[PDB]
Design an enzyme around this catalytic site. Structure first.
Site, PDB file in Angstrom:
ATOM      1  N   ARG A  32       0.020   4.526   2.969  1.00  0.00           N
ATOM      2  CA  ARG A  32       0.117   4.268   4.392  1.00  0.00           C
ATOM      3  C   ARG A  32       0.524   5.463   5.241  1.00  0.00           C
ATOM      4  NH1 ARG A  32       4.014  -0.506   4.841  1.00  0.00           N
ATOM      5  NH2 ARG A  32       4.447  -0.151   2.589  1.00  0.00           N
ATOM      6  N   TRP A  71      -9.096   6.220  -0.466  1.00  0.00           N
ATOM      7  CA  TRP A  71      -9.464   6.933  -1.694  1.00  0.00           C
ATOM      8  C   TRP A  71      -8.475   6.573  -2.802  1.00  0.00           C
ATOM      9  CZ3 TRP A  71      -8.238   9.782   2.809  1.00  0.00           C
ATOM     10  CH2 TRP A  71      -6.913  10.246   2.866  1.00  0.00           C
ATOM     11  N   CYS A 120       0.810  -1.221   0.000  1.00  0.00           N
ATOM     12  CA  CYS A 120       0.000   0.000   0.000  1.00  0.00           C
ATOM     13  C   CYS A 120       0.845   1.274   0.000  1.00  0.00           C
ATOM     14  CB  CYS A 120      -0.941   0.016   1.218  1.00  0.00           C
ATOM     15  SG  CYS A 120      -1.826   1.579   1.442  1.00  0.00           S
ATOM     16  N   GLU A 177      -4.822   4.105 -10.711  1.00  0.00           N
ATOM     17  CA  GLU A 177      -5.632   2.897 -10.521  1.00  0.00           C
ATOM     18  C   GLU A 177      -6.776   2.874 -11.522  1.00  0.00           C
ATOM     19  OE1 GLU A 177      -6.242   1.594  -6.271  1.00  0.00           O
ATOM     20  OE2 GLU A 177      -5.914   3.722  -5.867  1.00  0.00           O
TER      21      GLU A 177
HETATM   22  C1  HEM Z   1      -6.272   6.619   1.897  1.00  0.00           C
HETATM   23  C2  HEM Z   1      -5.644   6.523   0.716  1.00  0.00           C
HETATM   24  C3  HEM Z   1      -5.114   5.181   0.152  1.00  0.00           C
HETATM   25  C4  HEM Z   1      -4.400   5.118  -0.964  1.00  0.00           C
HETATM   26  C5  HEM Z   1      -4.034   6.346  -1.827  1.00  0.00           C
HETATM   27  C6  HEM Z   1      -4.075   3.735  -1.216  1.00  0.00           C
HETATM   28  C7  HEM Z   1      -3.362   3.253  -2.278  1.00  0.00           C
HETATM   29  C8  HEM Z   1      -3.169   1.931  -2.594  1.00  0.00           C
HETATM   30  C9  HEM Z   1      -2.759   1.413  -3.895  1.00  0.00           C
HETATM   31  C10 HEM Z   1      -2.497   2.239  -5.174  1.00  0.00           C
HETATM   32  C11 HEM Z   1      -2.655   0.088  -3.791  1.00  0.00           C
HETATM   33  C12 HEM Z   1      -2.300  -0.879  -4.930  1.00  0.00           C
HETATM   34  C13 HEM Z   1      -3.641  -1.563  -5.170  1.00  0.00           C
HETATM   35  C14 HEM Z   1      -3.897  -1.853  -6.615  1.00  0.00           C
HETATM   36  O1  HEM Z   1      -3.099  -1.402  -7.480  1.00  0.00           O
HETATM   37  O2  HEM Z   1      -4.915  -2.545  -6.884  1.00  0.00           O
HETATM   38  C15 HEM Z   1      -3.002  -0.285  -2.436  1.00  0.00           C
HETATM   39  C16 HEM Z   1      -3.009  -1.554  -1.920  1.00  0.00           C
HETATM   40  C17 HEM Z   1      -3.409  -1.895  -0.652  1.00  0.00           C
HETATM   41  N1  HEM Z   1      -3.902  -1.036   0.337  1.00  0.00           N
HETATM   42 FE1  HEM Z   1      -3.933   1.028   0.235  1.00  0.00          FE
HETATM   43  N2  HEM Z   1      -4.601   2.971  -0.197  1.00  0.00           N
HETATM   44  C18 HEM Z   1      -5.255   3.827   0.666  1.00  0.00           C
HETATM   45  C19 HEM Z   1      -5.943   3.421   1.787  1.00  0.00           C
HETATM   46  C20 HEM Z   1      -5.893   2.174   2.368  1.00  0.00           C
HETATM   47  C21 HEM Z   1      -6.566   1.783   3.590  1.00  0.00           C
HETATM   48  C22 HEM Z   1      -7.491   2.750   4.381  1.00  0.00           C
HETATM   49  C23 HEM Z   1      -6.247   0.495   3.832  1.00  0.00           C
HETATM   50  C24 HEM Z   1      -6.663  -0.431   4.999  1.00  0.00           C
HETATM   51  C25 HEM Z   1      -7.271   0.017   6.106  1.00  0.00           C
HETATM   52  C26 HEM Z   1      -5.356   0.049   2.776  1.00  0.00           C
HETATM   53  C27 HEM Z   1      -4.774  -1.200   2.654  1.00  0.00           C
HETATM   54  C28 HEM Z   1      -4.232  -1.741   1.499  1.00  0.00           C
HETATM   55  C29 HEM Z   1      -3.922  -3.143   1.290  1.00  0.00           C
HETATM   56  C30 HEM Z   1      -4.076  -4.335   2.260  1.00  0.00           C
HETATM   57  C31 HEM Z   1      -3.367  -3.233  -0.128  1.00  0.00           C
HETATM   58  C32 HEM Z   1      -2.903  -4.513  -0.846  1.00  0.00           C
HETATM   59  C33 HEM Z   1      -4.097  -4.998  -1.666  1.00  0.00           C
HETATM   60  C34 HEM Z   1      -3.707  -6.224  -2.445  1.00  0.00           C
HETATM   61  O3  HEM Z   1      -2.688  -6.873  -2.065  1.00  0.00           O
HETATM   62  O4  HEM Z   1      -4.418  -6.548  -3.439  1.00  0.00           O
HETATM   63  N3  HEM Z   1      -5.188   1.094   1.901  1.00  0.00           N
HETATM   64  N4  HEM Z   1      -3.302   0.863  -1.733  1.00  0.00           N
HETATM   65  C1  LIG Z   2      -9.232   0.433   0.004  1.00  0.00           C
HETATM   66  S1  LIG Z   2      -8.737   1.481  -1.189  1.00  0.00           S
HETATM   67  O1  LIG Z   2      -8.827   3.028  -0.694  1.00  0.00           O
HETATM   68  C2  LIG Z   2      -7.140   1.176  -1.579  1.00  0.00           C
HETATM   69  C3  LIG Z   2      -6.941   1.739  -2.970  1.00  0.00           C
HETATM   70  N1  LIG Z   2      -6.632   3.031  -3.094  1.00  0.00           N
HETATM   71  N2  LIG Z   2      -7.079   0.951  -4.040  1.00  0.00           N
HETATM   72  C4  LIG Z   2      -6.975  -0.496  -3.996  1.00  0.00           C
HETATM   73  C5  LIG Z   2      -8.097  -1.212  -4.751  1.00  0.00           C
HETATM   74  C6  LIG Z   2      -8.747  -0.331  -5.820  1.00  0.00           C
HETATM   75  C7  LIG Z   2      -8.531  -0.901  -7.220  1.00  0.00           C
HETATM   76  N3  LIG Z   2      -7.101  -0.765  -7.568  1.00  0.00           N
HETATM   77  C8  LIG Z   2      -9.362  -0.166  -8.242  1.00  0.00           C
HETATM   78  O2  LIG Z   2      -8.771   0.533  -9.094  1.00  0.00           O
HETATM   79  O3  LIG Z   2     -10.610  -0.270  -8.226  1.00  0.00           O
END
Ligand code: HEM
Ligand SMILES: C[S@@](=O)CC(=N)NCCC[C@H](N)C(=O)O
Ligand code: HEM
Ligand SMILES: C[C@H](O)[C@H](O)[C@H]1CNc2nc(N)[nH]c(=O)c2N1
Ligand SMILES: C[C@H](O)[C@H](O)[C@H]1CNc2nc(N)[nH]c(=O)c2N1
Ligand SMILES: C[S@@](=O)CC(=N)NCCC[C@H](N)C(=O)O
Ligand SMILES: [Zn+2]
Lengths: 411, 407
Positions: free
Chosen positions: B109, B278, B106, B283
């Site tokens: 974070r 968000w 992520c 993405e």
């Molecule tokens: C608030 C702004 C956030 C941003 C900008 C963000 C951004 C991202 C991005 C770009 C990825 C790659 C996912 C993909 O390409 O499909 C990711 C993965 C992930 N995020 Fe974040 N995220 C946010 C919030 C959160 C929150 C609130 C949580 C948990 C409470 C979280 C937990 C995770 C986890 C567990 C992954 C790995 C998902 C996987 O392995 O498929 N994220 N995030």
């Molecule tokens: C939980 S969410 O805020 C984490 C996030 N930013 N994206 C992860 C999943 C979203 C997915 N890549 C999509 O483009 O729909």
């Protein structure tokens, strides 16, 4: 044991057995992955097993495993080792070696070409002047008036580590970099340290933004010597853009022949510390990294200005916009001048096909995803979606320290 | 073995000590790196609980306190008799925030400690699950000013009474297989869209139909519910330069809310724990819109731009990719919906890494996932060495319910 890799765009699944023949280490443990880490005097004792393994490979490939020619060779190498503590590769074994090191290079996206490699045997070389001559011929041959041909030139192997052949340049052709008193850098910042060494060794620098560096060549453990590559041998391409006529006025050019000269070639336990090799460029090497890395030429600002983009907010993607135009211009210029180059779309597609072929005929293909995926437009290239396994096979190209950090100066 | 990581753009060097608390395995060995592979009882339970409680009491500075030892004893007894245990609210909140903190893939974070945790452990039915989820969505959407949230349903017991959200995200568009072999809407959701129809859903068969929720309570057969449209914030996609762009009829939703993962805290497993933050612009613009196995709009856009699509070396795909991503960011910003571009997000992640190394001794990070899918090397994370390892509390992948469920 068997290992599966999946492509998440096509669902093609491939089975790797080749990884079983891997002995060298990755840097990773079961508790930590070091996949993105840039980089994570040999005796009779360990030399013969290394030799034997290589010869087994070589003889297998030529359908002669277990033959009299195979067994006699093993005998001859063993005897030569115990009496001389090293041994000499036949010409055939050397060519096989150099090709397979390339084939095994997990960070190389251009490996579809691995079997077409011109190998120049420079093992009879003894002096820096001899090195200069060999290198000049390499450049002329590889350049081929713009129709590039892959080649490698192989200098004598290491003996006691006190008589190393080394090319002190990181590439045979690269631009100087000069740190200014005001802290700015003129030319290529990546080559400042080496430029300073050259100047100290007597180079008279033109002090421009694209000065082709001199060769700094070390034969037989002696102090290195300076040589100027004949300018008529150095092919360069002025950079212009097909729609933007102001682009030529940026004053950019690049050289056509990338020739990596600081790596170590290992074959059958033998170490070839001087082994310059050359192919041709993927456009993004120049257009993205060399021109746009903040620590390289760093032209994004200047290019963006002239395009008149909204540079006050990053979310305008002005950087992404400038970067594409710059990469269009690199490809355009090379193609117009008939200098071999490949775009990242074509190159990655070829790699996927290569990789699939290798799984079928070889049982696998070691690949470093971090390096294989191009530095722009990653996910619109098929390698992004390709799972890869990284492991180390021999023969191989290895990193080695820059010689100025180890060299014992004579005076 | 107190490892170092270098940034090759800035020469900054960080020393990692946090990795020496790695609990789980990476899938890598000394002989093979698997960094690009997508998916590599009471006796088991007590050390897991102890390890977690140890971190918890350390973090509140009461390590080795009466309160600490008491709580260990108390949980220890509960496990002995009940074969499980329940987290105090405070431990639940800490656990969830730290799962996010520990998510090596992520990039967002830096926000980890500002997570709104909704305790839904009193939930018993899918209707109740629906209610909790509507509250989540409304709270997190916040009229476009998005707020990170997680809603946590009851933990696994015997594996026969699991709570699951069958959707992969609370909000996603349907996928239909057409007669001509092609696909309408989102191809990633074709199978799930089938199962909804296979369950009773009346699909309007459009390009962007918001899927119904398929919710499973206490191991029962899952039930369909439709999210109130007024709760689903969507953004019409237009370009600040190309008038014809709006004609493409593109839209996306504002709230990415991952719902198919498993939250593990102190050995306890929460199989239903939808969480939301968000979007990073790429993405949507790069992956969802331009992946070949998704909406795959590149050719259509390049066409409208009248680019030379004869040869790959004109880089028409790249040119189009940029414009598409400009439009996504422009649209969300214009409608006042929270979104972050890949430059800002990666820069923030570098600052976060700095913070974690300094205050925590490290930051587990998966380069393959952290580096954005466009313009990689002009973002600072590209030049950043990262160490990847598994810390707990954590979010984990789990099988899709439909492959496991007895009806
Ligand atoms: C608030 C702004 C956030 C941003 C900008 C963000 C951004 C991202 C991005 C770009 C990825 C790659 C996912 C993909 O390409 O499909 C990711 C993965 C992930 N995020 Fe974040 N995220 C946010 C919030 C959160 C929150 C609130 C949580 C948990 C409470 C979280 C937990 C995770 C986890 C567990 C992954 C790995 C998902 C996987 O392995 O498929 N994220 N995030
Ligand atoms: C939980 S969410 O805020 C984490 C996030 N930013 N994206 C992860 C999943 C979203 C997915 N890549 C999509 O483009 O729909
Ligand atoms: C013929 C066309 C070739 C293309 C298009 C190509 C492409 C590339 C690219 C893009 C890289 C990454 C380089 C970087 O980002 O700095 C690379 C690395 C590498 N290539 Fe190739 N290559 C070609 C030929 C060759 C040849 C002829 C050899 C050796 C005989 C070779 C061996 C290697 C090795 C050992 C690396 C790793 C470099 C490192 O770790 O720094 N390649 N190649
Ligand atoms: C830290 C990271 O491993 C480093 O920046 C790598 C990333 N991938 C790369 N890929 C290529 N082809 N060339 C490189 O120099 C790098 N640099
Ligand atoms: C095969 C490869 O691991 C796979 O395509 C990964 C690459 N990096 C990724 N990075 C992010 N952020 N999201 C992804 O889905 C993927 N997919
Ligand atoms: C030996 S060469 O043909 C392999 C190659 N295509 N590039 C490797 C190094 C070139 C380097 N990235 C550069 O931009 O000069
Ligand atoms: Zn690894």
């Amino acid at each position: 044991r068997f290992l599966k890799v999946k492509n998440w765009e096509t669902d093609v699944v491939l089975t790797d057995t080749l990884h079983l023949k891997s002995t060298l280490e990755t840097g990773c443990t079961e508790h930590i992955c070091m996949g993105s880490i840039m980089l994570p005097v040999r005796t009779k004792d360990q030399l013969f097993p290394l030799a034997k393994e290589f010869l087994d490979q070589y003889y297998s490939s030529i359908k002669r495993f277990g033959s009299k020619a195979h067994m006699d060779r093993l005998e001859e190498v063993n005897k030569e080792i115990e009496s001389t503590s090293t041994y000499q590769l036949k010409d055939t074994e050397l060519i096989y070696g150099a090709k397979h090191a390339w084939r095994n290079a997990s960070r190389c996206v251009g490996r579809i070409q691995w079997s077409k490699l011109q190998v120049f045997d420079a093992r009879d070389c003894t002096t820096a002047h001899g090195m200069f001559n060999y290198i000049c011929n390499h450049v002329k041959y590889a350049t081929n008036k713009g129709n590039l041909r892959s080649a490698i030139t192989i200098f004598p192997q290491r003996t006691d580590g006190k008589h190393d052949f080394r090319v002190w340049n990181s590439q045979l052709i690269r631009y100087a970099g000069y740190k200014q008193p005001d802290g700015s850098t003129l030319g290529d910042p990546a080559n400042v340290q080496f430029t300073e060494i050259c100047i100290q060794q007597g180079w008279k620098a033109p002090r421009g933004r694209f000065d082709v560096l001199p060769l700094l060549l070390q034969a037989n453990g002696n102090d290195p010597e300076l040589f100027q590559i004949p300018p008529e041998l150095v092919l360069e391409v002025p950079i212009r853009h097909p729609k933007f006529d102001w682009f030529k006025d940026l004053g950019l050019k690049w050289y056509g022949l990338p020739a990596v000269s600081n790596m170590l070639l290992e074959i059958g336990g033998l170490e070839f510390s001087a082994c310059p090799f050359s192919g041709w460029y993927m456009g993004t090497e120049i257009g993205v990294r060399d021109y746009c890395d903040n620590s390289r030429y760093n032209i994004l600002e200047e290019v963006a200005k002239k395009m008149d983009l909204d540079m006050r907010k990053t979310s305008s993607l002005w950087k992404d916009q400038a970067l594409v135009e710059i990469n269009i211009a690199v490809l355009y210029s090379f193609q117009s001048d008939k200098v071999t180059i490949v775009d990242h779309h074509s190159a990655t597609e070829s790699f996927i096909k290569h990789m699939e072929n290798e799984y079928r005929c070889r049982g696998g293909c070691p690949a470093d995803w971090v390096w294989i995926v191009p530095p722009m437009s990653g996910s619109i290239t098929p390698v992004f979606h390709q799972e890869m396994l990284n492991y180390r096979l021999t023969p191989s190209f290895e990193y080695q320290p820059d010689p100025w950090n180890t060299h014992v100066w004579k005076g």
